[PDB]
Design a protein around this ligand. Sequence first.
Ligand SMILES: Nc1ncnc2c1ncn2[C@@H]1O[C@H](COP(=O)(O)O)[C@@H](O)[C@H]1O
Length: 248
Amino acid sequence: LSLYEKMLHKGMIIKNSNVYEKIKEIDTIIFNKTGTLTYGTPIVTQFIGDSLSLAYAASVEALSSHPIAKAIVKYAKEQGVKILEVKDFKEISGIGVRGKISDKIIEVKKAENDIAVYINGEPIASFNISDVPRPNLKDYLEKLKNEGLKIIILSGDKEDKVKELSKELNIQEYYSNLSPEDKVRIIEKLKQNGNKVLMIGDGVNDAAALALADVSVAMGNGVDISKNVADIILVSNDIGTLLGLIKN
Ligand SMILES: Nc1ncnc2c1ncn2[C@@H]1O[C@H](COP(=O)(O)O)[C@@H](O)[C@H]1O
């Protein structure tokens, strides 16, 4: 039907209307990592420590709703340990959680294996938690060879998580440990350098960068601040779908 309907049926909401004109001009495609190149769901990739520590950690995390707490709880159930009764539980907002089991103070909190487990102030185990990447690569390579598109990846994630993923999809140019303010500035430079930037984002740390892109795409599973500022919503959460469109 109408162009809007065609796109919607392609899995794309076009909030803008001028965006088509804008797309022919784009020469730089920037991906925010989290929830764009990956699902937005943290998993335990590794636990270091024993099963008693695992049980303690999950028992305490069972009382939090944070995605990380959930991922630990889920990992432990899969190992087959059961949830223990916790007393004097406390979330902290910044660090993590705390609680008392069998006369032992248990804390599960961040660190830098970012997540540590402390039994009576002594770090006893840790979790390495990370994301699940979306299936694909060729799609992106079709971009590289499509037009002469430069592809950049950005995230507030650590240089280890980002380097690994960029190695994976074969992107040379990426930047890690970035705050929104950093991202705004990188895009700023690019636009000042005369580049036309299309950016795909998803979630809190992407909104301000997206608002500043020449054309902006938010993911379907993306947060509201991101979507109310995006030119396009990939309600399909299917990047490939968006790719094709870039193949004008
Ligand atoms: N329930 C939790 N268990 C362990 N660590 C947490 C928890 N909640 C927050 N954190 C830590 O706090 C950081 C930032 O939290 P957030 O700002 O809410 O995403 C996370 O990356 C974790 O290191």
